[PDB]
RNA sequence: CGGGCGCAUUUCCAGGCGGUGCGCCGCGACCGGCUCCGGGACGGCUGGGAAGGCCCGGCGGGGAAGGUGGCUCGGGGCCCC
């Protein structure tokens, strides 16, 4: 992204800055599992009564 | 140090993305283990054994026996059924 400026020509402009404060010991990510569906994503079920 | 404000940084307000949640609960679909129930089709036997369903022509002997035949009881009009 550059966008015009005032004084100086142009600069560009990064999206996405980088993160200013970094918390110690992060924890790890998963193991990636499957066949796990949200709630609005499973299928309904009824009884034949 | 200096040249410089759509740019970058400091605070508050209101929302979404991935990691975390006072107490008491509930729900959903997948995964593993386990018990139980229902339904439907397949192979073998002596290519299962025995009954069923119509009868034609016909053989055998026999008993846990239709009539015949002393006797017993009862019903209806000595006798009769």
Redesign the pocket.
């Known amino acids: 992204t550059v966008?015009?400026?005032?004084?100086?020509g142009?600069?560009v402009?990064?999206?996405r800055?980088?993160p200013?404060y970094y918390?110690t010991e992060?924890?790890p990510?998963?193991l990636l599992s499957?066949?796990?569906?949200?709630?609005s994503q499973?299928?309904?079920?009824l009884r034949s009564s």
């Open positions: 966008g015009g400026d005032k004084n100086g142009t600069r402009v990064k999206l800055k980088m200013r918390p992060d924890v990510r998963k499957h066949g796990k569906k949200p709630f499973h299928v309904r079920r």
